[PDB]
């Protein structure tokens, strides 16, 4: 019902490069789930500390 296919190498890739560029992210300002850099640009100090 929610079967999702992933591999070891693919998961490592999506782990390492989900914070650099995300093809599933939104590239236009004003939408949610934007790029990680842009989200950091607006995040609070506590949020970026947790992300660290």
């Amino acid at each position: 019902s929610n079967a999702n296919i992933t591999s070891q190498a693919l998961n490592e890739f999506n782990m390492a490069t989900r914070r650099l560029f995300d093809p599933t992210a939104s590239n236009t300002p004003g939408q949610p789930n934007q790029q990680w850099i842009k989200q950091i640009n607006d995040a609070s100090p506590a949020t970026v500390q947790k992300e660290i």
Binding site: T6, N11, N14, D42, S44, A46, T47, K50, E51
Partner: protein, 82 residues
Amino acid sequence: QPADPSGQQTSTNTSNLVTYLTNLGKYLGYDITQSSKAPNPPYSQLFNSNVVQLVQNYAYNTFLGAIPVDAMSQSLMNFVTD
């Protein structure tokens, strides 16, 4: 009326307090004077804990499963006994 010096001194102290709070806000990197530029609503939690949690769980599962194991019996491919 006879002005109390305590009132004037407290007025100067409070103005100094507001100035010093503004300066501290500026030093920390924020502009405190206007509430509009402040975040609304504020956010303290992670961006999206659900998606990252899913990624970590899937990574743990993939590491556990991908590694090739001796497959001759159900009790022979175990990683940890009890």
